[PDB]
Structure 1
Amino acid sequence: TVAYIAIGSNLASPLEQVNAALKALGDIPESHILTVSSFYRTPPLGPQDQPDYLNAAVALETSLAPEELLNHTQRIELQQGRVRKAERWGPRTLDLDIMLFGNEVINTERLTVPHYDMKNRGFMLWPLFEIAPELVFPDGEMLRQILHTRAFDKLNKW
């Protein structure tokens, strides 16, 4: 099954954290990366003191069940998501979100697929459109149609 995973990091210098997470995704059992979007920069919209986010999308081929894939993404967040710089580990700065999982619809306590808010997030839709422009959602909405309707601002490459 082709799962599409959004990866974001708001560390001040996030390239090494993002690469550690991508390496970790490729090492998930019974799975392997098919394609990775470019890295994109998303400035914060409200308070300008928060760092920019680095955002990307990953196509992962996997035979795992959806909740099993979520277990691994959450393990990676626990293992790689915090960075130490001086005397303490900072807060979690890495987010891994399952956007789509084949054409399955999931609505459990733990997992909502398609991701509940991806249709409002250019930082999710634009990297996904780069790697899967013909993507169709389980209910028949088209990724191109969503971007056409909202005319989201394009994001700069990192």
Structure 2
Amino acid sequence: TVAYIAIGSNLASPLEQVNAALKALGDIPESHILTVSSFYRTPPPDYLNAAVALETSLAPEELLNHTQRIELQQGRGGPRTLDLDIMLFGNEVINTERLTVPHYDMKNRGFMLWPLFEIAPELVFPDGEMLRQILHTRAFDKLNKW
């Protein structure tokens, strides 16, 4: 299953943070990275944001245990300076105590949507909404690469 994960860091010099995170993402068992977006310096200091397409045989809650582990192990300041958010998990819709998939706010965030669109321009959400339409409709300003 293709999972799309948002990576965010508020570090002033967060490149290494994000590289640490990407390495660990690639080291998730039963998974491998398909594509990584450009890095984007986005208004909140400022964030470094990226999107990752991750092929995985893991159930969504398994994937979350791993991203949460990575936040603790690789976060310069634990989960607060490294944020790994599951945007989409294939076409699954999940509304559990631990997991709301698609991410409950991604449709409001250029810093999630534009990197996603870079790597998955033909993406359609479970409800049938198309990523291109949302960017069209909201007309989010294009982001600036890191």
TM-score bracket, shorter-length normalisation:
over 0.9
Structure-2 separation of matches of 1:89 and 1:123? 21
Give structure 1 regions of 4+ aligned residues with deviation exceeding 3 angstroms.
Answer: 88-91
Structure-2 separation of matches of 1:29 and 1:90? 22
Q: Is the 8 A contact 2:9 2:48 kept in 1?
A: yes
SS in 2 for 1:12: coil
TM-score after normalising by structure 1: 0.89
Q: Deviations over 1:96-144 (max 9, x none)?
A: 0000000010000000000000000000000000000000111111000
Q: Is the 8 A contact 2:71 2:79 kept in 1?
A: no
SS in 2 for 1:156: coil
Q: How much does 1:5 deviate?
A: 0.2
SS in 1 for 2:98: coil
Q: How much does 1:155 deviate?
A: 1.2
Q: How much does 1:43 deviate?
A: 2.1
Structure-1 separation of matches of 2:139 and 2:78? 36
Q: RMSD of the alignment, in Å?
A: 1.4
Q: How much does 1:26 deviate?
A: 0.3
Q: How much does 1:57 deviate?
A: 0.1
Corresponding pairs, count = 146
Gaps of 5+ in 1: 45-50, 82-87
Structure 1 residues 70, 91: CA separation in 2 closer, same or farther (over 3 Å shift)? closer
SS in 1 for 2:103: coil
Q: How much does 1:90 deviate?
A: 7.9
Structure-2 separation of matches of 1:135 and 1:74? 25
SS in 2 for 1:90: strand
Single out whichever of 18-27 and 146-155 deviates more from structure 2.
Answer: 146-155
SS in 1 for 2:5: strand
TM-score after normalising by structure 2: 0.96
Structure 1 residues 143, 90: CA separation in 2 closer, same or farther (over 3 Å shift)? closer
Q: How much does 1:89 deviate?
A: 5.7
SS in 2 for 1:3: strand
Structure 1 residues 15, 100: CA separation in 2 closer, same or farther (over 3 Å shift)? same
SS in 2 for 1:17: helix
Single out whichever of 89-98 and 61-70 deviates more from structure 2.
Answer: 89-98
Structure 1 residues 27, 43: CA separation in 2 closer, same or farther (over 3 Å shift)? same
Q: Is the 8 A contact 2:31 2:55 kept in 1?
A: yes
Structure 1 residues 99, 90: CA separation in 2 closer, same or farther (over 3 Å shift)? closer
